[PDB]
Symmetry: C2
Subunit: 98 residues, 2 copies
């Protein structure tokens, strides 16, 4: 009956240049399975392929996000949301683009 | 003729507890494709699944390493090596376990 906890992630506090290969990982630490992991960008759900963003479920507790070529469209607050029977958690990181 | 360049990564400032979920993304920035991306732990090569370490080539310029459940055996220097026909490059991060 353990609720999900998530390790912090960050694109870095320095703005990113267009064309860079950037990414973060949503790694659930403690938490009962089954767990669902999902993403939003500026509160809109994003899934693999949307806006050129790669999102891949590496394991039941890890989601990998990769932006192969950063654009100004990718600017904003990325949120990972992890949910199971016992509770839910989210953590965020703002991507800044020069 | 452009050799691979790699964004630095880190498991973090602080030592990690046993059982935690840790990982890094090796994201090549500059460099002509195709690029071979491989990993070592304390100078010895790692393959997907070895010592419970997940390794996945996510894209032509990104490789993801995940340790689903960290043990003290995972202690040491993780190196990502990126190679093409032009040249090679690497970046590292030391994983510490309490």
């Amino acid at each position: 009956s353990v609720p999900p906890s998530i390790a912090p992630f960050s694109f870095g506090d320095d703005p990113v240049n267009t064309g860079e290969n950037a990414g973060v990982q949503c790694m659930v630490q403690k938490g009962d399975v089954p767990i669902t992991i999902k993403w939003t960008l500026n509160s809109r759900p994003i899934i693999n392929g949307e806006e050129g963003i790669t999102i891949l479920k590496l394991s039941p507790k890890t989601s990998v996000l990769n932006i192969a070529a950063v654009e100004q469209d990718h600017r904003g607050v990325f949120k990972c949301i992890a949910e199971n029977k016992a509770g839910s958690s989210f953590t965020t990181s703002e991507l800044k683009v020069n």
